[PDB]
Amino acid sequence: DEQLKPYPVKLSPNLINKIDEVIKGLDLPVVNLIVESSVIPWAPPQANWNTWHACNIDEGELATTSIDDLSMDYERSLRDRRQNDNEYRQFLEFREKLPIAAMRSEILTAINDNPVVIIRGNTGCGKTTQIAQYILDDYICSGQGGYANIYVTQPRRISAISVAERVARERCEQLGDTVGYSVRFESVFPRPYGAILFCTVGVLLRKLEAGLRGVSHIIVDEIHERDVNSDFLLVILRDMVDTYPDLHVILMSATIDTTKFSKYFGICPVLEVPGRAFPVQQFFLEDIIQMTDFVPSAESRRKRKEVEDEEQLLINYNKVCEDKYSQKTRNAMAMLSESDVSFELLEALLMHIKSKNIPGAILVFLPGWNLIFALMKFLQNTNIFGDTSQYQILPCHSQIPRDEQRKVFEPVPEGVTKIILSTNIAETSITIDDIVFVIDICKARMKLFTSHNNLTSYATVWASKTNLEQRKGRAGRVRPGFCFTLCSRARFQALEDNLTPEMFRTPLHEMALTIKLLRLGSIHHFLSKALEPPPVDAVIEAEVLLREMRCLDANDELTPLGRLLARLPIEPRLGKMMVLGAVFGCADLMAIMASYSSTFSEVFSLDIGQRRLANHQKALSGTKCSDHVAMIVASQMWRREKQRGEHMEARFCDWKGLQMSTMNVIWDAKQQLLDLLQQAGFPEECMISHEVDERIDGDDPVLDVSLALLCLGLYPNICVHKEKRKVLTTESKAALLHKTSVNCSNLAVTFPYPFFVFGEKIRTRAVSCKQLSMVSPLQVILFGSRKIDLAANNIVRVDNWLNFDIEPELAAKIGALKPALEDLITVACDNPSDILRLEEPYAQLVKVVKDLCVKSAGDFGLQR
Ligand SMILES: Nc1ncnc2c1ncn2[C@@H]1O[C@H](COP(=O)(O)OP(=O)(O)O)[C@@H](O)[C@H]1O
Numbered sequence: 001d002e003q004l005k006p007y008p009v010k011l012s013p014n015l016i017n018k019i020d021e022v023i024k025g026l027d028l029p030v031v032n033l034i035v036e037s038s039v040i041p042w043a044p045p046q047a048n049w050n051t052w053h054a055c056n057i058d059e060g061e062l063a064t065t066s067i068d069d070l071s072m073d074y075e076r077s078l079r080d081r082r083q084n085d086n087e088y089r090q091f092l093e094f095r096e097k098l099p100i101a102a103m104r105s106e107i108l109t110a111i112n113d114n115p116v117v118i119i120r121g122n123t124g125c126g127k128t129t130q131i132a133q134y135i136l137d138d139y140i141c142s143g144q145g146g147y148a149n150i151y152v153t154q155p156r157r158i159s160a161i162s163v164a165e166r167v168a169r170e171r172c173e174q175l176g177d178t179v180g181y182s183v184r185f186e187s188v189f190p191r192p193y194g195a196i197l198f199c200t201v202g203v204l205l206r207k208l209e210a211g212l213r214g215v216s217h218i219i220v221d222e223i224h225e226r227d228v229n230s231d232f233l234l235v236i237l238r239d240m241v242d243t244y245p246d247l248h249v250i251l252m253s254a255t256i257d258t259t260k261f262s263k264y265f266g267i268c269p270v271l272e273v274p275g276r277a278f279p280v281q282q283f284f285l286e287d288i289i290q291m292t293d294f295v296p297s298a299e300s301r302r303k304r305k306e307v308e309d310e311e312q313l314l315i316n317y318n319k320v321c322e323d324k325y326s327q328k329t330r331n332a333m334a335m336l337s338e339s340d341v342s343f344e345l346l347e348a349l350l351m352h353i354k355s356k357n358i359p360g361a362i363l364v365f366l367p368g369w370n371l372i373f374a375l376m377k378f379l380q381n382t383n384i385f386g387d388t389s390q391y392q393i394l395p396c397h398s399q400i401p402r403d404e405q406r407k408v409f410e411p412v413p414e415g416v417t418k419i420i421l422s423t424n425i426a427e428t429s430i431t432i433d434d435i436v437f438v439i440d441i442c443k444a445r446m447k448l449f450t451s452h453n454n455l456t457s458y459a460t461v462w463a464s465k466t467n468l469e470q471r472k473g474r475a476g477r478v479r480p481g482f483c484f485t486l487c488s489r490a491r492f493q494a495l496e497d498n499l500t501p502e503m504f505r506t507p508l509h510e511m512a513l514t515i516k517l518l519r520l521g522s523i524h525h526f527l528s529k530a531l532e533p534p535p536v537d538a539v540i541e542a543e544v545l546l547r548e549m550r551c552l553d554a555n556d557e558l559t560p561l562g563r564l565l566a567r568l569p570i571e572p573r574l575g576k577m578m579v580l581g582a583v584f585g586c587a588d589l590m591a592i593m594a595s596y597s598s599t600f601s602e603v604f605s606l607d608i609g610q611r612r613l614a615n616h617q618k619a620l621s622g623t624k625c626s627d628h629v630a631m632i633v634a635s636q637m638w639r640r641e642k643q644r645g646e647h648m649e650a651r652f653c654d655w656k657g658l659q660m661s662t663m664n665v666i667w668d669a670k671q672q673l674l675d676l677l678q679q680a681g682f683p684e685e686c687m688i689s690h691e692v693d694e695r696i697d698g699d700d701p702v703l704d705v706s707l708a709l710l711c712l713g714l715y716p717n718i719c720v721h722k723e724k725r726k727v728l729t730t731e732s733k734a735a736l737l738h739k740t741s742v743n744c745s746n747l748a749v750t751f752p753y754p755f756f757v758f759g760e761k762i763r764t765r766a767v768s769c770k771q772l773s774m775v776s777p778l779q780v781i782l783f784g785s786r787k788i789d790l791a792a793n794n795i796v797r798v799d800n801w802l803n804f805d806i807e808p809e810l811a812a813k814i815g816a817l818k819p820a821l822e823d824l825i826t827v828a829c830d831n832p833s834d835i836l837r838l839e840e841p842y843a844q845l846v847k848v849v850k851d852l853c854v855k856s857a858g859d860f861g862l863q864r
């Protein structure tokens, strides 16, 4: 049965003496192995109240002024702007030509009569950009300008930011006067009365803590993606409208049978908004190879065979085609591979586009982030497509920093065709500029939750009928356009109808944390009140996981309460590891590791076609053999280069193969997490950065304890290397080390320790684990474990699949010490300002854990 050979490990007598002394000081039990609804408050607009911050103003102004005076001021200012601004006149002329204007008055009537109204219409017809302004202008011109307050919940950060900027531009002003936005890392707030605040749904859910006192309209945009946050918000607003009859809620959808939504809200009006127009032609893989005369490069086929023999060691719809097509067409179609994307095919497509000499920017729905930057660097390398003359390739996503959003959104002269590389965030979303050409690869990266309770996996899966229809409709927008769908006709015939609602394929622990943070009641009842309740077993699994490891005020009853790990914008496990790092004084390293582990961006840029990092990107990890350590060192010295001259910052980014966007994302997330810990009560003095000297070969207390807390925070992602690129994950499941990690090599390379912890598992072609870090057996025994047992021949069983050789009393001592760590977390949470001045027994526990989590602490008497 290929029994795993136990890893030899011993500790010095002084260490075990410290263990028994600390377990006697703590006096923990040892073994000889482990022992309602509050309807969020709402109130009409009231003087001396700031709606967005939910607190009384009490400042120099807005104190002795009634709402009516402000309404009169707003009305007079609006008339002045109408009668004095020519730009405003031109923008009004432009707004009066949209289809929404033809229904404008009608729309208002519904909002003035029914508390909830759904607005169904085509994307790009002017719903999010026009409805809020219509409501606000109606309220201002009606003499009630100060009585209006409009939240607009956009689905993603980039959508909210871009739509807020566009709305501000349409009113000939700047952000923060009457239109603002509030997304993660970035909040620009408008004036207290008569303003529009574009905020993402999660930001609104967090703002719900203090209540929506003073909000008159809430506009949930893009309800048809059916993400879990939108469903939470829909339930919340349903109860809010049921209790408060004066609140106005407007839901917006594009392509769905809105009958279900109408039935959900007790039969609410659904207004059908006329579709502007614009035709689109759809050509498939068959027609593409026919009119481009593509020759599938057999040399690249041999390369693909060589690079795919890996998975081969341990039904295709590309082979099916109708007889109307030529023999060469079907032969080349068969030669192509469905799973991978042929970049030579994309260059043939771009050749066809340039040959058509029809102007207009093109946009491509690339599968995923890695593929987006791979195509980025490939196109930048080519000559005809990639030079700054007549062409430029620009990426779009939510996680990219704001710096590139400005340059992609802003228009360019001479018509350089603006090749946009986007994820699926551009179908029912911002719509950017004019589009005439839509190239869809029919692939999308999705967090494919394999039901169960844990082991979050990610996979690139085929899109759906509705997504493809939306992407085809995204072609017509400035000139009749064309849609090149890169798949066979049989593949489209085999695509699923609609993608499943997100609630059925996401964990619900954060959902329940947010539910109980706002005092909404029992999780089961609240989830049963949703549109489509999630499967019950998922609810019990999430609740039992939350009732398991706690860094909160949670307990064991129907009202356990909850604080922290929910207001922290990170998964509860990583927040728990953050708090533990704040206890040990290594909060900075843990924060940056969490920021890198919660982001899908890659730390290292790989050239066009490789299997690993050749020498210099591997040199950063050095003797640690980990991506987290190399990531940390790269981030510090990148910060150094950025603090000094920007030129060498960029030059270094290119020279060591690091990505500026990735470093900026991890840096911003690290500072946000450190701040949100600061306001939680943890002093700054334990968050001082510790420089990581990778050159030191051996003992390093801060780095070793950081890897230990990583083992704690990434449970149950622990794997054992066997040979070459093969590792075993839980239940002894085979997996291959990701080619991007530093632990991958084509030579017969052996590691000092075989235990690794990995961030995510990308199932693009096979089970592949990325974000790898090698950890000693003691770290796995302490932190990266949950089940400890004694097997035959005095062999310790860890997680029922890991074999260890150790004295049973020592393993029992560590197992009893784990509840001591839990109680330390609870004590630190009780008084966050007293975490480095603890009781003497807890100080001893921290000291012994620090001395025990050392890299070389488990090699006593072993040459290794
Ligand atoms: N952030 C932006 N910057 C510049 N132009 C935009 C922006 N957002 C949308 N547009 C353009 O303005 C037009 C109005 O679209 P919009 O009403 O925002 O679409 P929807 O309301 O369906 O999201 C669109 O055709 C789009 O090309």
Ligand code: ALF
Binding pocket: 121, 122, 123, 124, 125, 126, 127, 128, 129, 221, 222, 252, 253, 254, 427, 428, 429, 430
């Ligand atoms: F109004 Al939309 F996508 F339909 F922003």
Ligand SMILES: [Mg+2]
Binding pocket: 163, 429, 430, 431, 432
């Ligand atoms: Mg838009």
